[PDB]
Design a protein around this ligand. Structure first.
Ligand SMILES: Cc1ccccc1CCC(=O)N[C@H](C(=O)N[C@@H](CCc1ccccc1)C(=O)NCc1ccccc1Cl)[C@@H](C)O
Ligand SMILES: [Mg+2]
Ligand SMILES: [Mg+2]
Lengths: 233, 233, 241, 237, 212, 250, 242, 235
């Protein structure tokens, strides 16, 4: 028993040639009430990892605190905490996947769908998903909720398999992400125009972009639409 | 001053000494010698195994803790079993939860904290075993020395047990040479067998006598006994 | 709540508390058991000191554990009741689960385990009791006799004795018990059992009590009158030379 | 432990203090916007790996702890302090204030002087950091006693260290920067080592400063450390 | 599933099918529904495969433990009561098992105990258990005699399982046969219903609702 | 954290003494005198307020305590032990009796409960016996008036009159000389005052003496009217002025 | 007498040392490992001639491939045997195989450690160490025939041959001279019988001494009284001819 | 709770030692009743006799005890014994047979003798009861938890002297009135005080319901003791 109250919608992501991109809009919905508008659902952990969370926002806030406590705990008695023994994306993920699976097993889930994005210390891109059931999987593209249905097909047109990854630039990947965010804004009734986007590059590091907006929207064609069948005026 | 002050680990002497701890320290000196040393690429344990009789096995001094970590023992052997099992569990927990190999340094801290609790609890005794811990983690080769007082120190080389003062002086003398035996397992082991020799009023070291272990850059922790040590005698 | 160690090792290798428990047995009234060809007889002495007792109601030393097995003891009377109760419970439990009464060896092994456990547990002292357990295995005619002691050691005996002056009666039994010619029947088995007590009791009126066990749950106590006739014939016969 | 002497003393605690006095010397210095911590690390043998037996410990992100006496007892105290700081932050969201944290440790150390089944801690601990209202430095004895300090020292070199600290308080009543206080810490440790000149030593420094570390606890390493070592080597001769 | 065991002049016959199902899906045709606990003890399985496999394997362990403890083979009465009592502890939790414990001891003679997950435990000469039980009963009961030869009694067991394998959608595969004596369990082979049916029809002249 | 004395601290000595109970009784002997006298229509319990400082305010510390509306107590020995015993006695009157039978316990049974609490401190692990003797005076419908003594061992005895503490032997002697079975309450109060004067060094007035009675019902102390079968507490602490009034014609 | 788990100034555990003394007071038990089996023999030592000697159980089966002989405070050995049997059967249940002899021994030695009170780390349900030692003989596929000496200290050694109990000093020196890697099971049987004969107070017959072995083919067997008697004849005739 | 090198339980022995200083209590079993008599520990004129019971307690309608030792220890045990009798009544719908109650109490004492590090109860009991299996019964239990049955028995001070006197004058065919006399004579002879007066005694009988077929416990009021003390010729 448990049910989500305040929620966040899609988290979408993909691998490009040198890293990962992840985005989520800034809305906290309360059923059909678009209740909160400055909600950050991208959580940087160190400078190699961003965790994207959708689902229940109270559980998201709980997971934020777990992530922060994990940075604290790793720094304890660790002279290499900002070098060789810094938290890796894969460490953060395995931790979360453990928590998620334990909580579902106790019949008390964290009502979330989570994407961990980042770069390993050897330069490898890391992109993995975990949800309220402890189900985990990895793919060149990952998305949650509506993003799964609508962003993935668009993103998969760019990175359809492993070999497509060396062929994909930051510019191309970000363009695809930004476009998929527009599509989501067109068709998801729980989406917002404002979103955050983060790039984690093996050369550039972490670029966190706040207060992005869907631009270049097509609405003009609406004027020609009259009635629902026979009506002419 | 030593009279009424050594009945338990929960009493300080008027000098500020804990005699039960000091007595536990004394069981290590009663133990058969073992040597540890490392270069930048490998770490080696060398141990003199001891038989009860000429009809008997020679008792094991080396225990594997994980693929990248193991230890040698001097003192109460059943205490080494208790502490290595704990260490195996800590190694395990780290892999399962965080997908992370336990830092040799953290293994040191965990052993220290465990020993400490027994130097302060009524009804219990301190551990009566010294341990030498080798491993290869994300910052290379490591050697540790554990005293059941809870003091753990990181060293390039060391020895514990009866007559170990010889081997220690030897290593102290050879420091600049063995630290640089990189990429050569056989030379590093040779220098370890060399070191344990300075601790023999015993005799010649035989094929039943000798126990060697190695871990390193591309070598999991591995124990050599019997016929497999002959090429070092 | 309290589990501090009271039973520990001595420099020379003994457990003092177990050894001192044996001393408590030594001072308890004597008990004896001998087995015939088709029976086992158990005898116990009652002390001279107090003889204004009510014999109807005073707990006797021979106790039925089940309908085919008996137990007697020497040592602390109060300690014996704890062992007897647990043994009785185990007997019913065994009938419940295996659908068969206990063997004499099984019951003994169980009582002995209880005794042993009280020698390695914190905050408890050993039982100041040694026991003689006797009876017949279900559907068996071969008589059984076992002895347990505070340590938890147990073994079988053709005849045995425990308690004060047991050394004397053991000596008597060692001379008078023949293994290839064991007491042919109940009467001569009872007689030998009474003779061995007469070495230690020194008027032995209702001071000696006897219980006879036969195959298939046939267990009977002997009355004053029935014992009297045994004592009478013993000293009357053993006079001439 | 739970035992008062006929004149109100606790011999066991007094004996625990002896273990502390037997320890390596450690100090803390409170500057105008932070705190500095230094400690003497005895080099028993060339075999000890340099820089790799770290004594100074962080609690949360804004607190440093150093101690003299039984090292394991100190680690035990820092584990507890970490549980205690996490518990505070979990409920109150804000990182634990230094005085708040001081009492947490204090009450814990004091508890180990109440019961016959326990021994007092064999350490004195110097600790502190920056909070909502400035720098704080503390020292905590085996009895659980603790006060705020302008500067503090414990262990074998304690008397000479306290003398040097006392001079600084007189010559600089108007505060004293974090960068100076680091230099001066290296100095005081060097002067305190005079006692133990038979064995060589290694210096460890950490600091927490509002302007120099942004109120976070940070180990002094690299050039900053070497500069402080050069200053101490210079001023000893 | 169909399983049976019956007592006769010359001991005990035990016979079982080898079909495993999940709903209407046939999971396996070659499953082992007899557990050989010891050289004198057999257990049969019906119901939940896991529940049966797991607890009758466990039973074997408990039986072996009795041997070491008491220096004697466990009675059939007692082996069955161990399983009966365990299963009774689990009552209402949803265990699903229909079980026969069959064997020989000196004291008991040949003995069969039926034990199920409701906690019922019964001693008797003839039991059929499983979804096919009624079919097995039909053939077994109408041809059972105490004085059957060993060869005939083995055949009746075999024939009764085939009957159930024919009519019960949830039985089939093969027959596994056992004979229990004084010295007692002897395996009498695996018999694939594929061949056995046509063979038995041919030689016996039975099964006349079948074409070909 | 955890107790290392899970064994009895009161044990038998070779001669049969229970040392700690004997030593507790010695502590009671050094205590300030308290006493109780039973009359035909009342009981009086009395004691001296020996003050620790004249800067102290002796009214803030009562030695005479209400336990139930019809039961009061006084003590000799260690005050703090008394204070906590009164708490537990008040509570046990409710938990073991009033919450069950909807009425207050009769005197003997409450005394019985207190005695149990003291007995347990005599057998339990890791504790010393209470260093007090109590006098408990009460009334109840079916037993009339009564007076009990309770000792560190948990023993209780019914008394017509008795004294405990310092000058108890002389006071018990003075009471045997003066007591009879026709005493009215005012007579018992008078004797209580006389007996107490021999035991009191300093000033002897309503500010230095403490006195209470178990008499008849005080409807004016009930706090409410309208239920006729509720008539008010029989326990009554005498005021300083009430005491001084009786000390004039003493 | 202060603590049950106190170190001496030399660094030894008092109570552990004294339990080893209790073992020296026990009946002699001898084990000899060959490539054709492992022989276990014990001195029965009846305290009186009325004791029925065959009720003396100092050799016990643990599993078909593992047996053991005991010496010392023999009542202490019951719960150790129970644990051993459970561990072996449980292993077979969990793993459909025989437990390794070395693993079985390590299990029994873990149980031996569980004395004290709790020991700030786990939990202890025993007030004193066991006052008994075990010789554990068996076969497994990896290491063949094996002999282990399980001590209440929690340590255990593998031996080619081993004596425990009151005659162990004399018997061990004897075993040092007589043992060789080529011994047959029959030669081992005879040696055990010979060395018991030497150290025993009483005259060795089939009633005051007991023999057993463990072979891969037939498992663990306690020889009955007729079989040992015939082996005693054979020893009498062998020595008398030398 | 530990053993001596002699095989004795120190604390039990010392508890027994303490009991031999308590007021003597005597029980005598006759064919038609039981007598319980006990001497109060030297008192005062000011002790309330009418509401005092330090030695004689009712366990149920058919069973009573006489106490020697610590009263507070005894009340603890009496209370559990009372509860135990009612549990039995509730379970079986029959009054508890006397031995069953005695055994249980004796087992509680034995326990303190064997585990827990607590001191034993410094108490000896004489139990006087009736049931339809053994009729009138008399038992005794001490701090060891041992218990025995008797026709006549004493506990507390001077048990040795009291026992000899009872052994002398007791006869199986006695009536209750003869037993009343014997108990008072024996106490008179063994007292450590001037005269055995009413104020120093507790007395009780278990007869046959005055006239009924039932069993009646009479716990003598002070006046009745004074009367029965003159009748037997000790005034
Ligand atoms: C109990 C459960 C929990 C969660 C998920 C699934 C399940 C049931 C799994 C199942 O049905 N398993 C099958 C089974 O037991 N089938 C039974 C028949 C269906 C059934 C009846 C009653 C209860 C549960 C299931 C069977 O073949 N039984 C015959 C059998 C076969 C092999 C060994 C022993 C036996 Cl008895 C096996 C074959 O895959
Ligand atoms: Mg200081
Ligand atoms: Mg079918």
């Amino acid at each position: 028993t448990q049910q989500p109250i305040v929620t966040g919608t899609s988290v979408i992501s993909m691998k490009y040639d040198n890293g990962v991109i992840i985005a989520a809009d800034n809305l906290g919905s309360y059923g059909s009430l678009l209740r909160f508008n400055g909600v950050e659902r991208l959580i940087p952990v160190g400078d190699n990892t961003v965790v994207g969370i959708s689902g229940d926002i109270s559980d998201m806030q709980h997971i934020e605190r777990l992530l922060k406590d994990l940075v604290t705990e790793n720094a304890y008695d660790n002279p290499l905490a900002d070098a060789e023994e810094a938290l890796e994306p894969s460490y953060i993920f395995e931790y979360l996947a453990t928590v998620m699976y334990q909580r579902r097993s106790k019949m008390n889930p964290l009502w979330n769908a989570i994407i961990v994005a980042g770069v390993q210390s050897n330069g490898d891109q890391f992109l993995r998903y975990v949800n309220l059931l402890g189900v985990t999987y990895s793919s060149p593209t990952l998305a949650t909720g509506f993003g799964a249905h609508m962003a993935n097909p668009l993103l998969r047109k760019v990175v359809d398999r492993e070999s497509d990854i060396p062929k994909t630039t930051v510019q191309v990947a970000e363009e695809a992400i930004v476009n998929a965010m527009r599509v989501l804004y067109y068709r998801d009734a729980r989406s917002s125009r404002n979103f955050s986007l983060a790039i984690i590059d093996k050369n550039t590091g972490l670029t966190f972009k706040k207060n992005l907006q869907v631009e270049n929207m097509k609405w003009d064609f609406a004027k020609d639409i009259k009635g629902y069948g026979t009506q002419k005026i | 001053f030593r009279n009424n002050y050594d009945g338990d680990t929960v009493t300080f002497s008027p000098t500020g000494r804990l005699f039960q701890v000091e007595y536990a320290l004394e069981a290590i000196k009663q133990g058969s010698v073992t040597v540890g040393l490392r270069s930048n690429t490998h770490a080696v344990l060398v141990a003199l195994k001891r038989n009860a009789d000429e009809l008997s096995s020679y008792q094991k001094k080396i225990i594997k803790c994980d693929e990248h970590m193991g230890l040698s023992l001097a003192g109460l052997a059943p205490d080494a079993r208790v502490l290595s099992n704990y260490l195996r569990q800590q190694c395990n927990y780290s892999s399962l939860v965080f997908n992370r190999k336990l830092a040799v340094e953290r293994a040191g801290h965990l052993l220290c904290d465990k020993a400490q609790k027994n130097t302060q609890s009524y009804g219990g005794r301190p551990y009566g075993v010294g341990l030498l811990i080798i491993g290869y983690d994300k910052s290379g080769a490591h050697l540790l020395e554990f005293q059941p007082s809870g003091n753990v120190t990181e060293l390039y080389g060391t020895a514990i047990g009866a007559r170990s003062q010889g081997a220690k002086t030897y290593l102290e003398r050879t420091l600049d040479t063995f630290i640089k035996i990189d990429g050569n397992p056989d030379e590093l082991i040779k220098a370890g067998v060399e070191a344990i020799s300075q601790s023999l009023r015993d005799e010649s070291l035989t094929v039943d006598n000798l126990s060697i272990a190695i871990v390193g850059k591309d070598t999991p922790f591995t124990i050599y006994d019997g016929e497999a040590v002959a090429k070092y005698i | 709540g309290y589990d501090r160690a009271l039973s520990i090792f001595s420099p020379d290798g003994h457990i003092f508390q177990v050894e001192y428990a044996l001393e408590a047995v030594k001072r308890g009234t004597c008990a004896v058991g001998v087995k015939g060809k088709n029976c086992v007889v158990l005898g116990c002495e009652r002390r001279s000191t107090l003889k204004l007792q009510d014999t109807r109601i005073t707990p006797s030393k021979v106790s039925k554990i089940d309908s085919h097995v008996v137990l007697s003891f020497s040592g602390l009377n109060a300690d014996s009741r704890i062992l007897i109760e647990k043994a009785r419970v185990e007997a019913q439990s065994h009938r419940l689960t295996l659908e068969d009464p206990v063997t004499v060896e099984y019951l003994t092994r169980y009582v002995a385990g209880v005794q042993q456990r009280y020698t390695q547990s914190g905050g408890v002292r050993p039982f100041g009791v040694s026991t003689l357990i006797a009876g017949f295995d279900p559907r068996d005619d071969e008589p059984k006799l076992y002895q347990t002691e505070p340590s938890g050691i147990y073994s079988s005996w053709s005849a045995q004795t425990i308690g004060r002056n047991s050394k004397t009666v053991r000596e008597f039994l060692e001379k008078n018990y023949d293994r290839k010619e064991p007491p042919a029947t109940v009467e001569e088995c009872v007689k030998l059992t009474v003779r061995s007590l007469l070495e230690v009791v020194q008027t032995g009126a209702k001071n000696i009590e006897i219980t006879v066990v036969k195959p298939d749950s046939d267990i009977v106590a002997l009355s004053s009158e029935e014992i009297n006739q045994y004592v009478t014939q013993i000293e009357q016969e053993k006079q001439e030379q | 432990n739970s035992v008062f002497s006929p004149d109100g003393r606790n011999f066991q605690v007094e004996y625990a203090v002896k273990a502390v006095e037997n320890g390596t010397t450690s100090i803390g210095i409170k500057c105008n916007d932070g705190v500095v911590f230094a400690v003497e690390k005895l080099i028993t043998s060339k075999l000890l790996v340099p820089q790799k037996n770290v004594k100074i410990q962080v609690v949360d992100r804004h607190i440093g702890c150093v101690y003299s006496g039984l090292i394991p007892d100190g680690r035990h105290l820092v584990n507890r302090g970490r549980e205690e700081a996490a518990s505070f932050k979990k409920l109150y969201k804000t990182p634990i204030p230094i005085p708040a944290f001081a009492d947490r440790l204090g009450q814990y150390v004091q508890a180990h002087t109440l019961y016959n089944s326990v021994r007092p801690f064999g350490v004195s601990t110097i600790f502190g950091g920056v909070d909502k209202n400035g720098a704080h430095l503390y020292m905590l004895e085996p009895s659980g006693s603790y006060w705020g300090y302008k500067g503090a020292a414990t262990g074998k070199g304690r008397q000479s260290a306290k003398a040097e600290l006392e001079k600084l308080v007189d010559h600089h009543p108007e505060g004293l920067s974090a960068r100076e206080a680091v230099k001066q810490a290296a100095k005081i440790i060097y002067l305190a080592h005079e006692d133990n000149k038979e064995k060589d030593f290694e210096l460890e420094i950490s600091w927490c400063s509002l302007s120099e570390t942004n109120g976070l606890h940070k180990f002094v390493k690299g050039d900053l450390l070497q500069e402080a070592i050069d200053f101490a080597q210079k001023e000893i001769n | 599933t169909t399983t049976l065991a019956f007592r006769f002049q010359g001991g005990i016959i035990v016979a079982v099918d080898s079909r495993a199902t999940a709903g209407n899906w046939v999971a396996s045709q070659t499953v082992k529904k007899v557990i050989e606990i010891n050289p004198f003890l057999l257990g049969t399985m019906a119901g939940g495969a896991a529940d049966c496999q797991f607890w009758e394997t466990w039973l074997g362990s408990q039986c072996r433990l009795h041997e070491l403890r008491e220096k004697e083979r466990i009675s059939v009465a007692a082996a069955s009561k161990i399983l009966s009592n365990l299963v009774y502890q689990y009552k209402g939790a949803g265990l699903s098992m229909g079980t026969m414990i069959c064997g020989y001891t000196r004291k008991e003679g040949p003995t069969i105990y039926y034990v199920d997950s409701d906690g019922t435990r019964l001693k008797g000469d003839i039991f059929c258990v499983g979804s096919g039980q009624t079919f097995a009963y039909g053939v077994l009961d109408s041809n059972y005699k105490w004085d059957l030869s060993v060869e005939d009694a083995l055949y009746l067991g075999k024939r009764s399982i085939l009957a159930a394998a024919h009519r019960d959608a949830y039985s089939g595969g093969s027959v596994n046969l056992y004979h229990v004596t004084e010295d007692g369990w002897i395996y009498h082979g695996n018999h694939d219903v594929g061949e056995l049916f046509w063979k038995v029809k041919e030689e016996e002249g039975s099964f006349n609702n079948v074409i070909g | 954290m955890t107790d290392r004395y899970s064994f009895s601290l009161t044990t038998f000595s070779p001669s049969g003494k229970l040392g700690q109970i004997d030593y507790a009784l010695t502590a009671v002997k050094q205590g300030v005198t308290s006493l109780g006298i039973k009359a035909t229509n009342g009981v009086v319990i009395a004691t001296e307020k020996k003050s620790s400082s004249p800067l102290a305010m002796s009214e803030t510390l009562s030695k005479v305590s209400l336990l139930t509306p019809d039961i009061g107590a006084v003590y000799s020995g260690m005050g703090p032990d008394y204070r906590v015993l009164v708490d537990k006695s008040r509570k046990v009157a409710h938990t073991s009796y009033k919450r069950i039978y909807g009425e207050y316990p009769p005197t003997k049974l409450l005394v019985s409960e207190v005695a149990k609490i003291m007995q347990e401190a005599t057998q339990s692990g890791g504790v010393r016996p209470f260093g007090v003797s109590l006098l408990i005076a009460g009334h109840d419908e079916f037993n009339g008036f009564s007076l009990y003594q309770v000792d560190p061992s948990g023993s209780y005895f019914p008394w017509k009159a008795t004294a405990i503490g310092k000058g108890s032997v002389a006071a018990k002697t003075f009471l045997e000389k003066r007591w009879n079975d026709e005493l009215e309450l005012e007579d018992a109060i008078h004797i209580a005052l006389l007996t107490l004067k021999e035991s009191v060094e300093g000033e002897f007035n309503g500010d230095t003496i403490e006195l209470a009675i178990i008499g008849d019902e005080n409807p004016d102390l009930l706090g409410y009217t309208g239920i006729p079968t509720d008539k008010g507490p029989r326990f009554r602490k005498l005021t300083s002025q009430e005491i001084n009034d009786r000390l004039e014609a003493l | 007498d202060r603590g049950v788990s106190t170190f001496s100034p030399e660094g030894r555990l008092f109570q552990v040392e004294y339990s080893l003394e209790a073992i020296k007071l026990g009946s002699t038990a001898i084990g000899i490992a060959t490539k054709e089996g492992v022989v276990l023999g014990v001195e029965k030592r009846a305290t009186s001639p009325l004791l029925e000697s065959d009720s003396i159980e100092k050799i016990v089966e643990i599993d078909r491939h593992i047996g053991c002989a005991m010496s010392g405070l023999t009542a202490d050995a019951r719960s150790m045997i129970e644990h051993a049997r459970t561990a072996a059967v449980t292993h077979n249940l969990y793993y459909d195989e025989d437990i390794n002899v070395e693993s079985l021994t390590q299990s029994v030695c873990d149980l031996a450690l569980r004395f004290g009170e709790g020991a700030s780390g786990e939990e202890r349900l025993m007030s004193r160490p066991f006052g008994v030692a075990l010789l554990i003989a068996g076969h497994d596929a990896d290491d063949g025939y094996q002999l282990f000496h399980a001590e209440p200290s929690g340590t255990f050694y593998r031996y080619n041959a081993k004596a425990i109990g009151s005659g162990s000093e004399g018997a061990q020196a004897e075993l040092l001279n007589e043992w060789h890697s080529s011994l047959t099971l029959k030669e081992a049987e005879l040696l055990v019988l010979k060395i018991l004969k030497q150290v025993m107070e009483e005259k060795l017959d089939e009633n005051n001494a007991q023999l057993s072995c463990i072979t891969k083919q037939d498992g663990f067997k306690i020889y009955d009284n007729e079989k040992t008697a015939e082996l005693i004849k054979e020893l009498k005739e062998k020595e008398a001819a030398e | 709770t530990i053993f001596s090198p002699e095989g004795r339980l120190y604390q039990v022995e010392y508890a027994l030692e303490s009991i031999s200083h308590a007021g003597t209590a005597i029980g005598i079993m006759a064919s038609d009743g039981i007598v319980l008599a006990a001497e109060r520990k030297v008192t005062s004129t000011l002790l309330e006799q009418d509401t005092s019971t330090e030695k004689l307690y009712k366990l149920n309608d058919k069973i009573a005890v006489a106490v020697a030792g610590l009263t507070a220890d005894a009340e603890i045990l009496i209370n559990t014994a009372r509860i135990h009798a009612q549990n039995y009544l509730k379970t079986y719908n029959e009054d508890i047979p006397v031995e069953i109650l005695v055994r249980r109490l004796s087992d509680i004492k034995q326990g303190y003798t064997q585990h827990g590090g607590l001191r034993p109860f410094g108490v000896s009991f004489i139990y006087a009861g009736y049931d339809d299996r053994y009729g009138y019964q008399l038992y005794t239990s001490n701090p060891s938890g041992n218990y025995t049955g008797w026709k006549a028995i004493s506990v507390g001070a001077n048990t040795s002297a009291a026992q000899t006197l009872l052994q002398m004058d007791y006869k199986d065919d006695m009536k209750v009135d003869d037993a009343i006399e014997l108990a008072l004579k024996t106490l008179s002879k063994t007292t450590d005080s001037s005269a055995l007066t009413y104020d120093r005694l507790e007395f009780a009988t278990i007869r046959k319901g005055a006239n009924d077929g039932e069993v009646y416990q009479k716990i003598f009021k002070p006046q009745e003791i004074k009367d029965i003390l003159v009748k037997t010729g000790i005034t």
